[PDB]
Design a protein around this ligand. Structure first.
Ligand SMILES: *[C@@H]1O[C@H](CO)[C@@H](O[C@@H]2O[C@H](CO)[C@@H](O)[C@H](O)[C@H]2NC(C)=O)[C@H](O)[C@H]1NC(C)=O
Ligand SMILES: *[C@H]1O[C@H](CO)[C@@H](O[C@@H]2O[C@H](CO)[C@@H](O)[C@H](O)[C@H]2NC(C)=O)[C@H](O)[C@H]1NC(C)=O
Ligand SMILES: *[C@@H]1O[C@H](CO)[C@@H](O)[C@H](O)[C@H]1NC(C)=O
Lengths: 555, 214, 222
C-alpha cells in the first residue's frame, strides 16, 4: 500500500509521548506517497525511524523539528509538492534539532533524492550538530515555477564538519558519504529544459516530468508534474465524459478517471467522495449532496430540489472556528442522526467560560447525542462529567468516518477521563485515522473491544497507555456478560456485546426468546425477539404467532 | 437558438410597491431558469435558481415562479436597494441564454429641468472644431425631446444625447445634447440655441448665448 | 469568503490576440467548473464557455469555436480565456463566474475585466472648462465643470478639488464619436452667490494616457 495521510500537529508537542513513535510507525510504515505533511517532531535520541525509508513523495511540507535523533532516513524522498507550507512559506523546515541543554541531534540532512520542491521554500535553523546544509545548491531543487523559492539557513554549529567525499564534484553533498553528493537537475540543462539527467539536449526530460528522468519519454519520469495517468505523466485526467463538439451531448467515457491527489484514478479511494465534475473530496460541493449510492459507496450527487438540511459539526460551516461543544451550541445537535463535522469535549465544555457568559454544560444535556448514528469528522474527549461512568450517550454512534482527523492523525481520542468503561455499544467502524485512549485512570473494557474489527486500513491502530491495567480489572471481578460471542464487549451487561451470542430483545442479549413460555409471547426473525399483536391468544407450550400482524395469530 | 424574452424592458415603481417581471422562453425549458440582479458598475448576483428557489441568503421577498415557457419574478415589496437590472436565464438546454433584461427604476413626483447652455473654451477654438452644450438638469421622467436650431432653422444628425443614472438622493435624470461642428462653420453664424420639450414643462423653452461678446 | 478576480483586459487592434486570467479562492477549486460570461456595453449577458479543472476540458458557445480557447492551471487556481482574431463585436466586460451545480447557472461572479477592440490609437483627453454665463441663475443657482473631449479609451476618472467636492457632481457618461474617440461633459451644480472666491479645479485621470490635465474653471469675459 503506497499512499498514506500525513499529520497536522506542527510544533505542538505529543499529547501522549509514550505512544508518539508508535503512531508514526503505523502512519508511514511502507508508505511512499504522503498526502499532506510529513511532520517528524520530538523523536528521542535512539528512535528507530527505519519505517520512513520508503517515502518518495510528500504532498504538503516536511517538518523535521525538536528531535534528538542523529539521523532521519529520508534518502528516497524525491519530490515535495508544497500544497500546504509550514508557516505558509516553507516546503522544508528543519528546526531546533539539538539537545535540550555523543551529543544528540541531527547530523546530516541525507536528502539525496530530493531533486524537486514545487512550491514554497527551505527553512533551516538551530541545529547544532548539522553539517553540509550550506553546501547544497538550493536554486536547483526549487522548480522553475516555484514562486516562493526562498532560503533561510543558519550555520551555527557545535562541531567541526568534515569536507564532502572527494568523489563529489563541487562543494556539494548531503552528508559525509560518497553516495551523498548532491545531484543537479535544473542548473545544468541544455536549452529551456525544466529538468534533465545530464548536460546534453537528448538528456532532457519530458515537459510533464518533475524530478528528473531515466530517459526522454513521459513514461521515464522520476515524478509527475501534474498527474500520473497509470504510468504516464500528463497535465489532466481523462474526462468522465465524451463530447460531440457541435451538439455538445455526452456519452460516458470508459477511459475516464477521477483526480485524486497527483494521480488519475478509476474510482476514488475508500473514505473519499467522487464528484460529478471529476474529482475526489471530503465535502460535497455546493448544490450537491452525499448519497449512499447503489453499491454502498458514498457519492456526491446533484440535488434537484434544494439540498436537505444537515447537521454541521465543529470545523464545519457556522461552527468552522468553534473549539468545543458548549452550553452555547449543544442544542444545535438536538435530533441529529448524522453530524457533518466533528465533536470535541474539552475541560472548558464542563467548567464554563465566565469571560463570555457561557454556562457550564450540565451532564443531562449530553443526552442530545442519543440519536446520533454517524460523525464524519472525529470524536475528541479530553473532559467528561465525573458523575457519568461511560460514553453511553453515544450509545447509538455506529461510525466515526475520520474524514477530518484531530491533529491530522486521530479519529478517536479519549484522554484524562475516569470513565470506567466505554459503552460505545454500536460503534462498528472507525473509517480512518488512529484511536488514542490514554490516561483514563479507571477505564476498563478496552482490551475487550476488538479494535482490529473497527478499522478499514493497515495504517490504523489503537494507541493506548496509562489506563487501568487489565489484570487489575479482571481482578476486581469485571467481565463481558456470558452472552457475548468471542468474549468481546464495550462494557458490563448483555447490552454491551459486539455480537449477540443468542437472540436480541431490543438491544438486550437474551438466552431465550418468548416463544412457548413468556409474558408477551414473541416470534423470532433472523435472531431477534419480536412481539405478536397484543390481541393474539397465548398458547400453552406452543407457537403463539408466525408474525407481528393479526392475521398471523393462532386464534 | 433559444430566446428568453423579458417584459417589460424598463419599469418605474416606488419604494414599497410589489414588482413583477415576466420572462418568456421560446421553447419548453421545464424548470431550468435562474434569475440575476445587476447594478451599474457591479457584477450579477444570483437570486433565484431552478425557476422558483431562493439562493442562500436572498431576502424572502424575492420569489420566482412558473414552469415550461412562462416564467415570473416577483419582489413582494420593493426596498431601496432593489432598484437595479434583473435578468432571467434558461440553463435547461445548450447553448445557455440570458434574457435581454429589465430595469427597475425609482418613480417620483413630476419635475422640470433648469435648461443651460455652455460655450467652447478659449483653448479649444484654435484646434479645428467646436462644441456647444444644452445641459438639462434634474428632471423627471426620462422622456424628453431635444432638437437644435441654429439662428433660424432646425438641425438633425450632429448631436448625441447623454443621460445620467438616476440621482441617489432626489431621484432625477439629466441630459446633454453635445453639438459638434467645424470652426469654419462656426465663424459663420451668430446665435445658437436648443429647445426643450418635457412632460413637466408647459412650454418648450430656450436659453441664450452670444458669440459676439463672450 | 469566495472570491474571483479577472485580469488581463485592455485595448487590442482588430485581428490581434489577447489573454484573460481568472484567479480563485475561498473554495475547493477542483470541485467546480468555471465559466466566462461577457457583457457588451449597454447590452446583456452572453455566455462564453465552461472549463473543467480535472479534465482540462471546455464546453464552449458555438459562436466562438476556433477563436476563444480555455485553459486551467490548478496549481494556482486560475482559468485562462485566450481570444484570437478579435473584432468589434467582442468589445465587452468579461466576467468570470462559478458554474454552480454543474448545471449552468452561476453564483459568485468576479468584478470583470474590460476588453476594447478598436483601431483608434491611444490619445489623451483634452480638457476644456465649461464657464457659466451671466443669465445662468434659476433664482440663485449656477453650474460649471470640465469637458474631456477626444480621449481613448474608457475610462477617465474625473473628480473635483482633489477630493473634497462630491456634492452635486454629475460625471456624464461618455459617448463614442464617429472619430472613434470619446467625449463627455462633467457638470456640477453649486450656489451662485459665490463664484469669484472659491477656486474650482477638476482632477482628470486617464490611465492608459498617464495624463493628469488639471483645469481651473473661471467666469467668462461677457
Ligand atoms: C505512476 O503510477 C504507476 C502505476 O501506479 C507507478 O508504477 C508502479 O511503481 C511501483 C513502485 O512504486 C511498482 O510496484 C509497480 O511495478 C508500478 N506499477 C505499474 C504497473 O506501473 C509509478 O511509479 C507512478 N509514478 C510515476 C511518477 O511514474
Ligand atoms: C549557537 O550560537 C548561538 C548564537 O547564535 C549561541 O547563543 C547563546 O550561547 C550561550 C552559550 O553557549 C547559550 O547559553 C545561550 O542560550 C545562547 N543564546 C541563544 C538565544 O541562542 C548558542 O549557544 C549556539 N548553539 C546552540 C545551543 O544552538
Ligand atoms: C460482528 O459479527 C459479524 C459477523 O456475523 C461481522 O460482520 C462483524 O465484523 C462482527 N463485529 C463487528 C465489527 O461488529
Amino acid at each position: 500500500t503506497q499512499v498514506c495521510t500525513g499529520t497536522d500537529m506542527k510544533l505542538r508537542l505529543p499529547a501522549s509521548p509514550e505512544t508518539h513513535l508508535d503512531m508514526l510507525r503505523h502512519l508511514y510504515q511502507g508508505c511512499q506517497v504522503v498526502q499532506g505533511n510529513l511532520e517528524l517532531t520530538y523523536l528521542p535520541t535512539n528512535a528507530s525511524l527505519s519505517f520512513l525509508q520508503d517515502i518518495q513523495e510528500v504532498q504538503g511540507y516536511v517538518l523535521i523539528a525538536h528531535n534528538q535523533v542523529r539521523q532521519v532516513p529520508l534518502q528516497r524522498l524525491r519530490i515535495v509538492r508544497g500544497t500546504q507550507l509550514f508557516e505558509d512559506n516553507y516546503a522544508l523546515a528543519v528546526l531546533d534539532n539539538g539537545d535540550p541543554l555523543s551529543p544528540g541531534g541531527l547530523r546530516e540532512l541525507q536528502l539525496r533524492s530530493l531533486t524537486e520542491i514545487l512550491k514554497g521554500g527551505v527553512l533551516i535553523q538551530r541545529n547544532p550538530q548539522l553539517c553540509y546544509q550550506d553546501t547544497i545548491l538550493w536554486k536547483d531543487i526549487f522548480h522553475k515555477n516555484n514562486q516562493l523559492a526562498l532560503t533561510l539557513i543558519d550555520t551555527n554549529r557545535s562541531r567541526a564538519c568534515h569536507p564532502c567525499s572527494p568523489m563529489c564534484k563541487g562543494s556539494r553533498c548531503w552528508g559525509e558519504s560518497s553516495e551523498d553528493c548532491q545531484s543537479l537537475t535544473r542548473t545544468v540543462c541544455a536549452g529551456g529544459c525544466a529538468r534533465c539527467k545530464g548536460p546534453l539536449p537528448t538528456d532532457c526530460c519530458h515537459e510533464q516530468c518533475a524530478a528528473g528522468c531515466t530517459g526522454p519519454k513521459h513514461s521515464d519520469c522520476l515524478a509527475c508534474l501534474h498527474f500520473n495517468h497509470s504510468g504516464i505523466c500528463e497535465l489532466h485526467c481523462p474526462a468522465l465524459v465524451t463530447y460531440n463538439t457541435d451538439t455538445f451531448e455526452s456519452m460516458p467515457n470508459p477511459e475516464g478517471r477521477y483526480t485524486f491527489g497527483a494521480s488519475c484514478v478509476t474510482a476514488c479511494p475508500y473514505n473519499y467522495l467522487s464528484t460529478d465534475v471529476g474529482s475526489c473530496t471530503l465535502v460535497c460541493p455546493l448544490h450537491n449532496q452525499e448519497v449512499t449510492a447503489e453499491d454502498g459507496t458514498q457519492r456526491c450527487e446533484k440535488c434537484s430540489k434544494p439540498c436537505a438540511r444537515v447537521c454541521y459539526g465543529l470545523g464545519m460551516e457556522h461552527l468552522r472556528e468553534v473549539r468545543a461543544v458548549t452550553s452555547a451550541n449543544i442544542q444545535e445537535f438536538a435530533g441529529c442522526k448524522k453530524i457533518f463535522g466533528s465533536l470535541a469535549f474539552l475541560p472548558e465544555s464542563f467548567d464554563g467560560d465566565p469571560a463570555s457568559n457561557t454556562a457550564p454544560l450540565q451532564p443531562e444535556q449530553l443526552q442530545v447525542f442519543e440519536t446520533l448514528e454517524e460523525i464524519t469528522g472525529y470524536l475528541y474527549i479530553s473532559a467528561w462529567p465525573d458523575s457519568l461512568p461511560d460514553l453511553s450517550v453515544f450509545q447509538n454512534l455506529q461510525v466515526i468516518r475520520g474524514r477530518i482527523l484531530h491533529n491530522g492523525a486521530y479519529s478517536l481520542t479519549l484522554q484524562g477521563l475516569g470513565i470506567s468503561w466505554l459503552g460505545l455499544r454500536s460503534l462498528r467502524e472507525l473509517g480512518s485515522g488512529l484511536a488514542l485512549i490514554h490516561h483514563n485512570t479507571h477505564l476498563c473494557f478496552v482490551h475487550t473491544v476488538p479494535w482490529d474489527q473497527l478499522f478499514r486500513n493497515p495504517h490504523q491502530a489503537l494507541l493506548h497507555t496509562a489506563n487501568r491495567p487489565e489484570d487489575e480489572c479482571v481482578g476486581e471481578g469485571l467481565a463481558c456478560h456470558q452472552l457475548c460471542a468471542r468474549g468481546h464487549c464495550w462494557g458490563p451487561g448483555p447490552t454491551q456485546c459486539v455480537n449477540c451470542s443468542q437472540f436480541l430483545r431490543g438491544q438486550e442479549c437474551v438466552e431465550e426468546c418468548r416463544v412457548l413460555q413468556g409474558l408477551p409471547r414473541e416470534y423470532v426473525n433472523a435472531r431477534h425477539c419480536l412481539p405478536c399483536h397484543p390481541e393474539c391468544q397465548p398458547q400453552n407450550g406452543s407457537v403463539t404467532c408466525f408474525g407481528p400482524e393479526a392475521d398471523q395469530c393462532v386464534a | 437558438d433559444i430566446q428568453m424574452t423579458q417584459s417589460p424592458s424598463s419599469l418605474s415603481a416606488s419604494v414599497g410597491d410589489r414588482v413583477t417581471i415576466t420572462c418568456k422562453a421560446s421553447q419548453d425549458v421545464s424548470i431550468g431558469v435562474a434569475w440575476y440582479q445587476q447594478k451599474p458598475g457591479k457584477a450579477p448576483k444570483l437570486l433565484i435558481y431552478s425557476a422558483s428557489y431562493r439562493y442562500t441568503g436572498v431576502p424572502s421577498r424575492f420569489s420566482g415562479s412558473g414552469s415550461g415557457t412562462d416564467f415570473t419574478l416577483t419582489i413582494s415589496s420593493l426596498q431601496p436597494e432593489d432598484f437595479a437590472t434583473y435578468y432571467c436565464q434558461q440553463y435547461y438546454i445548450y447553448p445557455y441564454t440570458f434574457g435581454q433584461g429589465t430595469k427597475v427604476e425609482i418613480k417620483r413626483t413630476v419635475a422640470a429641468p433648469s435648461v443651460f447652455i455652455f460655450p467652447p473654451s478659449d483653448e479649444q477654438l484654435k484646434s479645428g472644431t467646436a462644441s456647444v452644450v444644452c445641459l438639462l438638469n434634474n428632471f423627471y421622467p426620462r422622456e424628453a425631446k431635444v432638437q437644435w436650431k441654429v439662428d433660424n432653422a432646425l438641425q438633425s444628425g450632429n448631436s448625441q444625447e447623454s443621460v445620467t443614472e438616476q440621482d441617489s438622493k432626489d431621484s432625477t435624470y439629466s441630459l446633454s445634447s453635445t453639438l459638434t461642428l467645424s470652426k469654419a462653420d462656426y465663424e459663420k453664424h451668430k446665435v445658437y440655441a436648443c429647445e426643450v420639450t418635457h412632460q413637466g414643462l408647459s412650454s418648450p423653452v430656450t436659453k441664450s448665448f452670444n458669440r459676439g461678446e463672450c | 469568503e469566495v472570491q474571483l478576480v479577472e485580469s488581463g483586459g485592455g485595448l487590442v487592434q482588430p485581428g490581434g490576440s489577447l489573454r484573460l486570467s481568472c484567479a480563485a479562492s475561498g473554495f475547493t477549486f477542483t470541485d467546480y467548473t468555471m465559466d466566462w460570461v461577457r457583457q457588451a456595453p449597454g447590452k446583456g449577458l452572453e455566455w462564453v464557455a465552461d472549463v473543467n479543472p480535472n479534465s482540462g476540458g471546455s464546453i464552449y458557445n458555438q459562436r466562438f469555436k476556433g477563436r476563444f480557447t480555455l485553459s486551467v492551471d490548478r496549481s494556482k487556481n486560475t482559468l485562462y480565456l485566450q481570444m484570437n482574431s478579435l473584432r468589434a463585436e467582442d468589445t465587452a466586460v468579461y466576467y468570470c463566474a462559478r458554474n454552480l451545480g454543474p448545471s449552468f447557472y452561476f453564483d459568485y461572479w468576479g468584478q470583470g475585466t474590460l476588453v476594447t477592440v478598436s483601431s483608434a490609437s491611444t490619445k489623451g483627453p483634452s480638457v476644456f472648462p465649461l464657464a457659466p454665463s451671466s443669465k445662468s441663475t434659476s433664482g440663485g443657482t449656477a453650474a460649471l465643470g470640465c469637458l474631456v473631449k477626444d480621449y481613448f479609451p474608457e475610462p477617465v476618472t474625473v473628480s473635483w478639488n482633489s477630493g473634497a467636492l462630491t456634492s452635486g457632481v454629475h460625471t456624464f457618461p461618455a459617448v463614442l464619436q464617429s472619430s472613434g474617440l470619446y467625449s463627455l461633459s462633467s457638470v456640477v451644480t453649486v450656489p451662485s452667490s459665490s463664484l469669484g472666491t472659491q477656486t474650482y479645479i477638476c482632477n482628470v485621470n486617464h490611465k492608459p494616457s498617464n495624463t493628469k490635465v488639471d483645469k481651473k474653471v473661471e467666469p467668462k469675459s461677457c
